Amino acid sequence: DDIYKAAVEQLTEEQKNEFKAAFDIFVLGAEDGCISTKELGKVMRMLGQNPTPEELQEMIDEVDEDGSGTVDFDEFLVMMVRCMKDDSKGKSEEELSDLFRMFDKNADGYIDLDELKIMLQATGETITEDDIEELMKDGDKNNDGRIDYDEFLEFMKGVE
């Protein structure tokens, strides 16, 4: 999600205005102003594609943040950036392995909170406590408080 959310933040106002015009086509006549599988299917067919009901439900589930079963405009912008890549290929595991070693300052095999904090400060961006805590919670999937090698690869998946 994070790489796509960043791409959305960076869209210009004119680009968002064009996406809004497209969104309005998709939700024309919808009871709640949102895109359900009935509006998504009618547009995909209008576009020449023939998705199954399951494919349509999965396209919505991939960006549905509230659990509405529908796509709102904010969710739509994520759908539209996900449908395109600037970040093609996305590197690979061998390159992430060498980068992992650079985060692991004590060479223990894990990235701890102090290591993460040192690396974040080095970026030059203002780092708040919330930036540190949130990235470590996003990375450490087993709740030990550290990022292992396999968690690091999931953590940096798709990051250019």
Binding site: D2, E18, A22, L47, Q49, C83, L99, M119, D130
Partner: protein
């Protein structure tokens, strides 16, 4: 924090890690230079006569055999580590296998083609 902020931090984190990797390589090259200065010191040939030069060549040749044996010994340890790395890599892959085979979809109609079809000439920035 927004996911958009997290991405920017992750992209900058990877850029610094890459810089540190280059830094490590440069430092290792410096370390290599110094190690070689100690292990393989320069020849002093001035003043050696013919017989002394013949003995030096024999002495250097003998050293070549000894260094090659030391190199062999480290190489053997490196070789054993490759076998272990290959076996552990297969083990982790299998432990981390199960239900995780990945897929891609083509339901993701490119937003460029979609925008040209739905908006026509209105579609200029996207």
């Amino acid at each position: 924090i927004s996911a958009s902020r997290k991405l920017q931090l992750k992209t900058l984190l990877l850029q610094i890690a890459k810089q540190e990797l280059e830094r490590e390589a440069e430092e290792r090259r410096g370390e290599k230079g110094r190690a070689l200065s100690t292990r393989c010191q320069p020849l002093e040939l001035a003043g050696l006569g013919f017989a002394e030069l013949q003995d030096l060549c024999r002495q250097l040749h003998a050293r070549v055999d000894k260094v090659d044996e030391e190199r062999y010994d480290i190489e053997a340890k490196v070789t054993k580590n490759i076998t272990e790395i290959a076996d552990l890599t297969q083990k982790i892959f299998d432990l981390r296998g199960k239900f995780k085979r990945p897929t891609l979809r083509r339901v993701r109609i490119s937003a460029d083609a979609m925008m040209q079809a739905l908006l026509g000439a209105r579609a200029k920035e996207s």
